[PDB]
Structure 1
Amino acid sequence: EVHHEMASIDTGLSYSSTMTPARVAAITTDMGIHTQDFFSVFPAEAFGNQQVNDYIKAKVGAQNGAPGLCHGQQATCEI
């Protein structure tokens, strides 16, 4: 193991550095309409009748990975 220690002090009193964005290089989130799954968020919640719950789950599309992604990282949507 190779070790080293360092010590730092801010010299002045005010802000002494400025970072700023200059150029966008890529947009990653695809700006899509993918909606977040509440059922996967709350696995406890359920209705009264078991078959009614199962039918709602069937029609809604509730639940992986995705094989191929044409745009990029999907961005969840909330309503």
Structure 2
Amino acid sequence: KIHPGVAMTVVRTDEILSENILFSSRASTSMFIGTPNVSRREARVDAVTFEVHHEMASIDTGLSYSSTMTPARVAAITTDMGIHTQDFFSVFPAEAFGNQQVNDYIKAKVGAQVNGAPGLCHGQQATCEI
């Protein structure tokens, strides 16, 4: 627990599940619907598969925006805001040092290792980077 020569800034990204409200003004878009269709494909020995199609064209009615949404309420946090770090060895799997014994020693000490987690307590780990 000596201080090495340099500090470090850690960056992490987090996810939040929210409920939103969308407002849309009247007569703000025009839709041209087409005619639906049925087709036949991938005929096999024991079954056939039909595909069903449809087409519509939309074009804006005014000049400016007509609808707007904003997160009305947060339901749950997902990422766990942890200390989990990104391992460079994993990100780059080809780079290496000169001496093979040094490389193996460094991997062993650092802990480079994929089903890393048989089970979780908090949620989807949020990768931290330095």
Richer in strand (by share) = 2
Q: Bigger shift: 48-57 or 1-10?
A: 1-10
Distance 2:124 2:111 in 1: 21
> How far is the alpha carbon of 1:5 from its aligned partner?
1.1
SS, match of residue 90 in structure 2: helix
Task: Return the structure number with greater relative CO, CA threshold 8 A, min gap 6.
Answer: 1
- State the match for 1:70 in structure 2: 121
* Percent of aligned pairs with the same amino acid: 100
After the TM superposition, which segments of 4 or more aligned residues of structure 1 sit over 3 Å from their partners?
none
Q: CA deviation at 1:65?
A: 3.7
Gaps of 5+ in 1: none
Compute the displacement of 1:2 (Å). Answer: 2.5
TM-score (norm 2): 0.59
Q: What is the CA deviation profile of residues 3-61 of structure 1, one whole-angstrom value per residue up to 9, with x for unaligned ones?
A: 22111010001011101011000100001110001000011111111000100000000
Equivalent-residue separation in structure 2 for 1:15 and 1:47 (angstroms): 57
d(CA) in 1 for partners of 2:126 and 2:52?
42
Q: Which moved more, 1:67-76 or 1:57-66?
A: 57-66
Aligned residues: 79
Task: Kindly indicate which of the two structures has a greater share of residues assigned to helix.
Answer: 1
Which sections of structure 2, spanning at least 5 residues, go unmatched? 1-50
C-alpha separation in 2, matches of 1:65 and 1:54: 20
